[PDB]
Write a protein that binds this ligand. Structure first.
Ligand SMILES: Nc1ncnc2c1ncn2[C@H]1C[C@H](O)[C@@H](COP(=O)(O)O)O1
Ligand SMILES: Nc1ncnc2c1ncn2[C@H]1C[C@H](O)[C@@H](COP(=O)(O)O)O1
Ligand SMILES: Nc1ncnc2c1ncn2[C@H]1C[C@H](O)[C@@H](COP(=O)(O)O)O1
Lengths: 524, 524, 524
């Protein structure tokens, strides 16, 4: 990739091509790149007991396309989800171009901008995965959903290890990575970048809700050939009757005692809250009794971490007054602030579909006897609040969302367990590589006599250009023998003043709701 | 198409090549492209009871060549129409080039402009016809008739469906189209665009007036062998005579009772008005009794729409004091305003030629008895005001004008009827494609710290370049055995201070009159 | 097709195979055939003034598959309609088999049935179309929607011409057709029938609702270059002002006066009624003033015929209190009788979608002046109630329904107009052929001495067997650049006691609602 100054170095492609069981999304967006940290690396750190962290902020920016709406349009996502029991990324190709480097000159009063033709910009992809991976933390920076929205490239920054739960102080293990210590490609207008990636083979995402329920997978018309204890006494009253060993053949209408082959999957109880302000308990944000303490969390090296997405568990409804972590929440259309007090201002996700295989988040997994029953003792009935893997469990994973993550890098650790990103998406060992970009520094007028001191005065600059990502998605059509019509993502937003999923009168594009994927159905 | 900065990317071609029965018009014009809607899409809507509408306005512009004077010169149009009984578009080729992108900087006092070499402009043709077609609504935006007139590219905007006749409110059917969701070609100075199209096979336009009249297509020297009822009585006085059944052989001088094989085509009565202000009735513009109400109109979903061009019908004369819809009216040479009160300030079209086959607009189709005549009853003589298609009808279509439309897209509907654009022109299923163009957004100085908010600050820009359209027209020479000379479009504007059909002393080109096409003659 | 007694002569196939743009439905059903008209042809006739009719009833039965639900399942119809802008029949193959002939013997008290192995049954297809075509009259007899529902084969009967509007008396033109005067194929158990058909090339059915509205097909941002009369006076008051000729440039916000190229299609006013019993007028069924008289109807040879389906016209809503002919009405799920008084007991269809191109059924087409306006006269504003074809009209046709007709035979007449069955469906010149079937007569014990009198005593018999129809449907996927999600047929029947579109607890299958086809959208 290399030509002249007055020659576009690439074209605008915003395809959409469906077929058999392959769909290829292609999209381009214009971007802007500032001069981060005024050209330098800055060591980050701040002791915040549990929020304690340390690291570094770099002068580099980076492209992030880890959000579904970066590739599919509303209509597409609809297509995709109303006719396919699953999908998955297969291949990706990214390309940056039409680089334009600008140098600003703030006048006596206001700023004036001009084209620095010979100025260069750098790009390079960490395809060896030797740098903290940031594109999968569910953070901002991905491309805009709306094709014609210009966006700012995010600043690259990474965290180191926090030794302790007190100080951000760093050990001899903490490491510093320098992006200049990498081979980068230098570009000027007329040059361009391009790269290709191939997704690892990964399981198709569900994209369907279950019909049958795990506890009702038998023939309602027939007896088991298995027997069990029905009751130890004769009455209808606890601890009172002639006392006997009553065994049953386990036949229809019973079912809750039918011997079964599979159990619901692992769960960890979550605290449930109400959207109606006065049904909660009045826990504060800050303080020694901050919400954190009362919400189910994990503990790493003395530090707390909300069990946020957490294990795949059946959740509350999107409409239900109850909600909780485990439920993804996105900003509403009219919500533009770091804070809100009106539930109706936000968007609530829901894993209600999982109630066919997984346990409910706020409830429990089941119950255990708290001791050994006797003729002179009925044991306490304990609560199975958290339960790990056990032979015979099966479960569904969290759904995927139109404005959700697409993939996440699996942690470089010997051993794990069922690698599905908890925020959702595809867990890859080596995922789409992070592409870094940064404007090259331009020394301003220099001293006329030598100085071993590093340069300070730099011309002020910023760049802009387009970028396009093309991902090949493998999808699988359904083919069920279900007779009755299925549920489907439909418009149904009724009459409206300014069409939904479209810019308003002021020219602002905003996403009305969150869209799932599990509309279609498959049995167990 | 791709070369250097100091290298013209195309040349100026304003041909004219006649021959056998093929004529090729080629013309180029310089254009200017602004930054529409300040870069964004805006939802349009306004409840105006009957004028109610909704839609969107885009940041894109578009080339429109759907006007005859965009291609032929006065003299050409003359050539074309004085020797050919018909013509039609055959092929088209368009090309944009010499792109120049400029960035403005308004100084403390006044503006200053400079060349942004690396800035890009986008172009693309919706050749899949997947976008509201606008080029055929008889609106402004086509190229200037005068070769050396710079023009502004029109803003693309489209309307959605209006559900109701009250509110502009939109339903789940209304759709939003985004032009960035298309593959567009990016250009810089030195790049260029080009495309080719081939007109569908379509009937040659008339270009001739009829000699014979539909009701007089027999031999004036001979009797029919058919008989008919002449009169039911004996006198010369209605309802008075000896009463008898008088049949005739239907011979010469009669003719109005001759049995004929064809009837005049469909018509719908139109209200006629006078150019002399006090011969009308004093209907107001606005109000509950707006002109609309009193003028023949159609009704779609409770909304009114003037039956404007309407069915092909014989019209008043261009000089006659009477005029009406059904008659195309263009702005006069000295008329420069959205309004006028002096008929002589405007230009009146006329379908007077159709009086040989079609019914007259303001009159009626014919008459019917309002009941069954009897010896004790003479029925009311009813007025056949509107009549649809009936086996045996034949008719001529509206003429074509030098400054008229050339083609129009036939509506995507199962079924229609005789697809001739009512404003006139060629009805194509897939017509010359709409070519969209828009300047690419250029972020102004950006923030030094990341922000997930879409960019606002953009350098101010506008572009200019040339464009040329070449259309190959198939024409058919006459070959009549008519003996007497034919009528012809002649100059005859007598003496003049500043030659007509030429710029004036001030350098302004203005079109004197409207030119038809039906000067030559063919019989029936 | 011919084998043994203990050898199935065919298998059960109830496929469903989707693909590219071709879908093949295959379905089988079990049937029963009685002995119609006790073996003989009976001349039909009954003078009922306007309901007068004559004809013949035959001893033959016939297979009818002219209903969409005979082939697609709920889910299929859903698939089909949420992803395709159209479809059409391409090829068909039918086959009858597993013939079983039974002979009944009513005992002293009750009946006893036995297998008559050697008894034969006849089948034959009128593929020369030489017999009144009955399969397209929107009558009963088609196969059951539910695969496992046994059905009775319909009796074949046809009507002759009614000369007059008084007597059922027949002329020398009336004709009698005898099915025995055809080559039929005789079968016994072990034999079978089979046949293939290929649909004529026919336009794909719409399957989409329009976005844009016919009267709003321009760019809302630009002026026309055409001028028109705005008002004849100065005030805001009719017949009062300084009186002038006010012409306008016809620019935005106006639109109802914009010169347009196309008009709404033909229409004929229909009377509208209310579902709320006391908003009507109290017209009786029978009588000299029967509803017929007051409802728009046609008149053939003095006989009346409700203009029932009638012309494609925008209709009321399915929920609207107003309804009318022009709207297809089907029996509700709980409606089991020839009569009903509760609108909510039935199912109402709706062509509300056509309001983008067609005129509204109950309203009118538009308005005309009732005379010529003058300075001393403002003409009556007439109502354009019925309007036929007129150059420039365009329109959409009636939708298709899940339980609607599929095709209809075009009448054997020189000339017609836009052959789309008015009840809906595909108008074919030569449609799927009528397959006739009838049990062969079996003489009971006969006289021992000769008699030239035709046989009377026949063993009592009836037959049963399976039949399967396979139709290859050509469908076209969409491919719009619409951005916002589309409307879609979704379940949404909320919670329920007995799942919908599925048998109830009693084992009865009933269709909840009627399903259209126009969920997807295309512009104009
Ligand atoms: N997103 C994703 N990525 C990878 N694997 C997934 C994912 N979702 C479910 N699984 C399953 C597939 C295999 O059973 C498995 C292997 O983990 P391993 O430790 O590699 O033996 O985990
Ligand atoms: N401008 C134009 N375009 C197309 N057809 C025209 C036009 N003017 C007249 N006609 C006639 C030619 C055929 O008779 C016809 C077909 O309409 P169809 O519905 O395609 O059968 O309409
Ligand atoms: N269902 C159906 N069948 C056939 N034609 C249809 C149908 N629907 C619309 N049309 C249109 C297609 C052609 O324009 C036409 C020809 O009628 P013709 O009299 O054959 O010239 O009618």
């Amino acid at each position: 990739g290399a030509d002249g100054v007055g020659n576009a170095s690439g074209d605008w492609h915003c395809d959409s091509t469906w077929s058999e069981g392959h769909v290829t999304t292609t999209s381009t967006r214009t971007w802007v790149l500032p001069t981060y940290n005024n050209h330098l690396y800055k060591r980050l750190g701040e002791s915040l007991q549990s929020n304690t962290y340390n690291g570094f902020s770099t002068p580099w920016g980076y492209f992030d396309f880890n959000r579904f709406h970066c590739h599919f349009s509303p209509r597409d996502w609809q297509r995709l989800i109303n006719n396919n029991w699953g999908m998955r990324p297969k291949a990706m190709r990214v390309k940056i171009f039409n680089i334009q480097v600008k140098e600003v000159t703030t006048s006596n009063g206001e700023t004036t901008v001009a084209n620095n033709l010979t100025s260069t910009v750098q790009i390079f992809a960490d395809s060896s995965y030797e740098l903290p991976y940031v594109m999968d933390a569910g953070q901002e920076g991905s491309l805009p959903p709306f094709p014609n929205d210009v966006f700012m490239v995010p600043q690259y920054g990474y965290c180191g290890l926090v030794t302790g739960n007190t100080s951000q102080q760093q050990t001899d293990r903490n490491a510093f990575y320098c992006l200049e210590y990498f081979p980068s490609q230098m570009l000027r207008t007329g040059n361009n970048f391009e790269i290709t990636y191939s997704f690892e083979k990964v399981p198709f995402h569900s994209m369907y809700a279950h019909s049958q329920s795990l506890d009702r997978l038998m023939n309602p018309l027939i007896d088991q050939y298995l027997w069990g204890l029905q009751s130890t006494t004769t009455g209808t009253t606890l601890n009172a009757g002639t006392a006997t060993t009553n065994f049953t053949k386990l036949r229809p209408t019973n079912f809750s005692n039918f011997k079964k082959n599979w159990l619901p999957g692992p769960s960890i109880k979550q605290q449930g809250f109400s959207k109606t302000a006065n049904q909660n308990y009045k826990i504060p944000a800050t303080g020694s009794d901050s919400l954190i303490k009362y919400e189910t969390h994990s503990t790493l090296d003395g530090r707390w971490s909300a069990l946020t997405p957490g294990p795949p568990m059946a959740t509350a409804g999107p409409a239900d007054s109850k909600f909780s972590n485990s439920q993804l929440i996105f900003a509403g259309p009219k919500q533009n602030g770091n804070t809100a007090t009106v539930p109706g201002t936000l968007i609530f996700t829901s894993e209600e579909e999982l109630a066919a295989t997984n346990a409910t988040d706020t409830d429990m997994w089941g119950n255990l006897p708290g001791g050994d029953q006797s003729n002179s003792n009925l044991p306490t009935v304990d609560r199975l609040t958290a339960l790990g893997a056990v032979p015979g469990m099966v479960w569904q994973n969290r759904d995927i969302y139109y404005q959700g993550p697409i993939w996440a890098k699996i942690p470089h650790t010997d051993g794990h367990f069922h690698p599905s990103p908890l925020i959702g998406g595809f867990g890859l060992k080596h995922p789409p590589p992070q592409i870094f970009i940064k404007n090259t520094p331009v020394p301003a007028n220099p001293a006329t006599t030598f100085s071993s001191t590093p340069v300070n005065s730099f011309i002020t600059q910023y760049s802009t250009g387009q970028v396009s990502v093309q991902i090949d998605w493998e999808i699988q059509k359904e083919r069920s023998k279900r007779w009755n019509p299925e549920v489907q993502f439909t418009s149904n937003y009724g009459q409206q003043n300014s069409l939904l999923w479209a810019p308003d009168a002021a020219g602002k594009y905003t996403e009305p709701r969150a869209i799932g994927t599990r509309y279609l159905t498959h049995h167990l």
